[PDB]
Amino acid sequence: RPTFYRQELNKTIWEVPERYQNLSPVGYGSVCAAFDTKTGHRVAVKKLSRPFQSIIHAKRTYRELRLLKHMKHENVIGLLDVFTPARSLEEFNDVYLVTHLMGADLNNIVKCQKLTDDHVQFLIYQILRGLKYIHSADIIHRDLKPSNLAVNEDCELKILDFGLHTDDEMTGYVATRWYRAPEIMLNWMHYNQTVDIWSVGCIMAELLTGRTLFPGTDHIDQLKLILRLVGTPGAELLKKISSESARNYIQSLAQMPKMNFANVFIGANPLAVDLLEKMLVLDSDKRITAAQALAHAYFAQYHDPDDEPVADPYDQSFESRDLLIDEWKSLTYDEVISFVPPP
Ligand SMILES: CC(=O)N[C@@H](Cc1ccc(O)cc1)C(=O)NN
Ligand SMILES: [Cl-]
Ligand SMILES: [Cl-]
Ligand SMILES: [Cl-]
Ligand SMILES: [Cl-]
Ligand SMILES: [Cl-]
Ligand SMILES: [Cl-]
Ligand SMILES: [Mg+2]
Give whole-number Cα distances, 182 to 139, 190, 214, 341, 343, in Å: 19, 12, 11, 39, 41
**Cα angle 256-258-260, degrees, rounded to a multiple of 5:** 130
CATH class entry, domain 106-299: mainly alpha
**Cα angle 283-257-203, degrees, rounded to a multiple of 5:** 55
Distance separating alpha carbons of residues 193 and 134, to the nearest angstrom: 9
29-51: string of b/e by CB count within 10 Å (b at 16+)?
bbbbebbbeebeeebbbbbbeeb
Alpha-carbon dihedral 221, 225, 230, 234, rounded to 10 degrees: 20
Beta bridge partners of 12: 9
Residues of the chain with a following break (C to N over 2.5 Å): 27, 164
Query: Measuring CA to CA, which residue among 47, 63, 57, 59 is closest to residue 8?
Result: 47
Beta bridge partners of 81: 98
Distance separating alpha carbons of residues 220 and 231, to the nearest angstrom: 15
314 alpha carbon to ligand 7 midpoint, in Å? 4
What residues are in contact with ligand 1 under a 6 Å CB criterion?
186-188, 219, 243, 245-246, 249-250
Inter-residue contact 64 to 332 (CB < 8 Å): no
Beta bridge partners of 21: 35
Question: In units of Å, what resolution does this entry have?
Answer: 1.7
- Number of residues assigned to the chain: 343
Rounded to the nearest angstrom, the gap between the alpha carbon of residue 315 and the centroid of all alpha carbons in its chain is 19
Distance separating alpha carbons of residues 121 and 204, to the nearest angstrom: 9
Distance separating alpha carbons of residues 320 and 302, to the nearest angstrom: 40
User: Active-site positions?
Assistant: 161
Angle between helices 195-209 and 117-136 (to 10 degrees): 170
First to last CA, the chain: 19
Residue type, 240: K
Ion ligand 2 residues within 5 Å by Cβ? 2, 17-19
- The 3-class SS string of the chain reads CCCEEEEEECCEEEEEECCEEEEEECCCEEEEEEEECCCCCEEEEEEECCCCCCHHHHHHHHHHHHHHHHCCCCCECCCCEEECCCCCHHHCCCCEEEEECCCCEHHHHHHHCCCCHHHHHHHHHHHHHHHHHHHHCCCCCCCCCHHHEEECCCCCEEECCCCCCCCHHHCCCCHHHHCCCHHHHCCCCCCCCCHHHHHHHHHHHHHHHCCCCCCCCCHHHHHHHHHHHHCCCCHHHHCCCCCHHHHHHHHCCCCCCCCCHHHHCCCCCHHHHHHHHHHCCCCHHHCCCHHHHHCCHHHCCCCCCCCCCCCCCCCCHHHHCCCCHHHHHHHHHHHHHCCCCCC
Distance separating alpha carbons of residues 7 and 22, to the nearest angstrom: 11
To test the pocket of ligand 1, the residue of 227, 237, 243, 252 to mutate (highest count of ligand atoms within 8 Å of its CB) is: 243
**Cα angle 241-246-249, degrees, rounded to a multiple of 5:** 130
Query: Measuring CA to CA, which residue among 54, 50, 3, 9 is closest to residue 29?
Result: 50
